[PDB]
Design an enzyme around this catalytic site. Structure first.
Site, PDB file in Angstrom:
ATOM      1  N   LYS A   1      38.652 103.035  59.804  1.00  0.00           N
ATOM      2  CA  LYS A   1      37.509 103.176  58.907  1.00  0.00           C
ATOM      3  C   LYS A   1      37.618 104.543  58.262  1.00  0.00           C
ATOM      4  CE  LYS A   1      33.094 103.122  60.395  1.00  0.00           C
ATOM      5  NZ  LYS A   1      31.716 102.655  60.662  1.00  0.00           N
TER       6      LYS A   1
ATOM      7  N   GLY B   1      38.153  95.334  53.974  1.00  0.00           N
ATOM      8  CA  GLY B   1      36.689  95.373  53.753  1.00  0.00           C
ATOM      9  C   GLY B   1      36.207  96.692  53.186  1.00  0.00           C
ATOM     10  N   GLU B   2      35.468  96.650  52.084  1.00  0.00           N
ATOM     11  CA  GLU B   2      34.784  97.828  51.497  1.00  0.00           C
ATOM     12  C   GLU B   2      33.337  97.769  51.981  1.00  0.00           C
ATOM     13  OE1 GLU B   2      35.522  98.688  47.342  1.00  0.00           O
ATOM     14  OE2 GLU B   2      37.390  99.634  48.054  1.00  0.00           O
TER      15      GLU B   2
ATOM     16  N   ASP C   1      20.920  98.404  63.114  1.00  0.00           N
ATOM     17  CA  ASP C   1      21.573  97.785  61.932  1.00  0.00           C
ATOM     18  C   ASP C   1      22.345  96.540  62.309  1.00  0.00           C
ATOM     19  OD1 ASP C   1      22.068  97.654  59.191  1.00  0.00           O
ATOM     20  OD2 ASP C   1      23.765  98.997  59.339  1.00  0.00           O
TER      21      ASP C   1
ATOM     22  N   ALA D   1      29.366 100.525  51.772  1.00  0.00           N
ATOM     23  CA  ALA D   1      28.626 101.753  51.386  1.00  0.00           C
ATOM     24  C   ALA D   1      29.370 102.983  51.932  1.00  0.00           C
ATOM     25  CB  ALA D   1      27.200 101.676  51.921  1.00  0.00           C
ATOM     26  N   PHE D   2      29.955 102.833  53.129  1.00  0.00           N
ATOM     27  CA  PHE D   2      30.465 103.904  54.029  1.00  0.00           C
ATOM     28  C   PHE D   2      31.816 104.404  53.537  1.00  0.00           C
ATOM     29  CE2 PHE D   2      31.621  99.697  55.687  1.00  0.00           C
ATOM     30  CZ  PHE D   2      32.999  99.777  55.705  1.00  0.00           C
ATOM     31  N   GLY D   3      32.526 103.531  52.819  1.00  0.00           N
ATOM     32  CA  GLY D   3      33.973 103.634  52.545  1.00  0.00           C
ATOM     33  C   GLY D   3      34.668 102.325  52.869  1.00  0.00           C
ATOM     34  N   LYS D   4      35.857 102.379  53.461  1.00  0.00           N
ATOM     35  CA  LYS D   4      36.827 101.246  53.497  1.00  0.00           C
ATOM     36  C   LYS D   4      37.253 101.093  54.946  1.00  0.00           C
TER      37      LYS D   4
HETATM   38  C1  LIG Z   1      38.066  94.101  60.855  1.00  0.00           C
HETATM   39  O1  LIG Z   1      38.688  94.752  61.991  1.00  0.00           O
HETATM   40  C2  LIG Z   1      38.055  95.692  62.744  1.00  0.00           C
HETATM   41  N1  LIG Z   1      38.440  96.046  63.884  1.00  0.00           N
HETATM   42  C3  LIG Z   1      36.931  96.477  62.393  1.00  0.00           C
HETATM   43  N2  LIG Z   1      36.559  97.475  63.143  1.00  0.00           N
HETATM   44  C4  LIG Z   1      35.442  98.107  62.598  1.00  0.00           C
HETATM   45  C5  LIG Z   1      34.802  99.227  63.121  1.00  0.00           C
HETATM   46  C6  LIG Z   1      33.696  99.732  62.518  1.00  0.00           C
HETATM   47  C7  LIG Z   1      33.150  99.120  61.370  1.00  0.00           C
HETATM   48  N3  LIG Z   1      31.995  99.637  60.864  1.00  0.00           N
HETATM   49  C8  LIG Z   1      31.509  99.023  59.810  1.00  0.00           C
HETATM   50  N4  LIG Z   1      31.976  97.956  59.174  1.00  0.00           N
HETATM   51  C9  LIG Z   1      33.096  97.412  59.656  1.00  0.00           C
HETATM   52  N5  LIG Z   1      33.528  96.235  59.125  1.00  0.00           N
HETATM   53  C10 LIG Z   1      32.919  95.413  58.148  1.00  0.00           C
HETATM   54  C11 LIG Z   1      32.322  94.200  58.464  1.00  0.00           C
HETATM   55  C12 LIG Z   1      31.862  93.354  57.468  1.00  0.00           C
HETATM   56  C13 LIG Z   1      31.991  93.722  56.133  1.00  0.00           C
HETATM   57  O2  LIG Z   1      31.661  93.018  55.001  1.00  0.00           O
HETATM   58  C14 LIG Z   1      31.108  91.713  55.156  1.00  0.00           C
HETATM   59  C15 LIG Z   1      32.560  94.942  55.792  1.00  0.00           C
HETATM   60  C16 LIG Z   1      33.015  95.747  56.805  1.00  0.00           C
HETATM   61  F1  LIG Z   1      33.661  96.886  56.485  1.00  0.00           F
HETATM   62  C17 LIG Z   1      33.781  97.986  60.795  1.00  0.00           C
HETATM   63  C18 LIG Z   1      34.968  97.518  61.435  1.00  0.00           C
HETATM   64  S1  LIG Z   1      35.974  96.188  60.966  1.00  0.00           S
END
Ligand SMILES: COC(=N)c1nc2ccc3ncnc(Nc4ccc(OC)cc4F)c3c2s1
Length: 329
Positions: free
Chosen positions: A41, A18-19, A138, A21-24
């Site tokens: 992350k 998953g990409e 959020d 705004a924050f990075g990857k």
């Molecule tokens: C996917 O496995 C995981 N344990 C994750 N742990 C975290 C921890 C912090 C996270 N903080 C922000 N986003 C996460 N994911 C995310 C969810 C949906 C998205 O697009 C529809 C993109 C994403 F990158 C995170 C994720 S994803």
């Protein structure tokens, strides 16, 4: 960075998520925890995101030590580190976000029994932040993840995916704010943004309740009832769906630009006007059944989208709503 085969902090071997705004977010084997798979992350080396990541680690140290067994289903942070001046946060590995599941399901809705379990756990998790003088700010389908996203497929008078286990956790504490901490004017991803936020009337725990209600419609329908990238348009969609904004909130708001006297300053016959008319209608009309359990979800959604955040139902009250009775049998 961020190619598979790469090793982070002489420990985490990149294998795939998953990409943004924050990075990857990447999946890694932890070579120093018996090859446990983890999510990592990697945050953009950009002031806004650095700030947010430092802040998310702070919040995650608190939540994880307050709730070491994860009874309240906030994602567990394992460790954090720097890799070429990028902040990397290591978490337990979850499954797909609810957003990514819905999308991979051809933007088909969740069945009602799954929405009930998911709604309950969301309210439980977020209420826990609310108990600890935190607001998420959020919440959205992207930030609700299945512990495990395995499914069964089957045709339907369109092919459909059902979850084996609908359990979820909540992620992204980068915007989470303490009661006494400075409160940004802009919070939430537009489509889940509360009216107290748009109107800059100041916000707290209740802005999360509005977000959740929006999430629950989206799970029910497979699409948002606020398909917009404009504030005034957003308020107009709220009107056709939820009824007029309250007298008091309109006359408090310094956001006077959205207003002509006391009415929303809105052209019905303009491009966006015509869009709102056609695409928006009274909330209860989106119901797919008149079944009691449908009526019960919708009663809860309607409370969660109370304009006045004081009157807005709390997550503590939400957990005792009838829609959840079926879970207590
Ligand atoms: C996917 O496995 C995981 N344990 C994750 N742990 C975290 C921890 C912090 C996270 N903080 C922000 N986003 C996460 N994911 C995310 C969810 C949906 C998205 O697009 C529809 C993109 C994403 F990158 C995170 C994720 S994803």
């Amino acid at each position: 960075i961020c190619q598979s085969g790469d090793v982070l902090s002489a420990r985490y071997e990149i294998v795939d998520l998953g990409e943004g705004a924050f990075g990857k977010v990447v999946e890694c084997i932890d070579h120093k925890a018996g090859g446990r798979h983890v999510a990592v992350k990697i945050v953009k080396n950009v002031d806004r995101y650095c700030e947010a990541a430092r802040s998310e680690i702070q919040v995650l140290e608190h939540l994880n030590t307050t709730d070491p067994n994860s009874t309240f289903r906030c994602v567990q942070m394992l460790e954090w580190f720097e890799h070429h001046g990028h902040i990397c946060i290591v978490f337990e590995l979850l499954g797909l976000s609810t957003y990514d599941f819905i999308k991979e399901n051809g933007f088909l809705p969740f069945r009602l029994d799954h929405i009930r379990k998911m709604a309950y756990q969301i309210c439980k998790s977020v209420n826990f932040l609310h108990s600890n003088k935190l607001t998420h700010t959020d919440l959205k389908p992207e930030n609700i993840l299945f512990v495990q996203s395995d499914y069964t497929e089957a045709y339907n008078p369109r092919d459909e995916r059902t979850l084996i286990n609908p359990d979820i956790k909540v992620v992204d504490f980068g915007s989470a704010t303490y009661d006494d901490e400075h409160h940004s004017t802009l919070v939430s991803t537009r489509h889940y943004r509360a009216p107290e936020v748009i109107l800059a009337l100041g916000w707290s725990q209740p802005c999360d309740v509005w977000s959740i209600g929006c999430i629950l419609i989206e799970y029910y329908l497979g699409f948002t009832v606020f398909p917009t990238h404009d504030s005034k348009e957003h308020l107009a969609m709220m009107e056709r769906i939820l009824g007029p904004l309250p007298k008091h909130m309109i006359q408090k708001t310094r956001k006077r630009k959205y207003f002509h006297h006391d009415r929303l300053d809105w052209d019905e016959h303009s491009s966006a006007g015509r869009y709102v008319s056609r695409a928006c209608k009274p909330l209860k009309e989106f119901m797919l059944s008149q079944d009691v359990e449908h009526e019960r979800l919708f009663d809860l959604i309607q409370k969660m989208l109370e304009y006045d955040p004081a009157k807005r139902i709390t997550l503590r009250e939400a957990l005792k709503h009838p829609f959840f009775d079926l879970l207590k049998k």
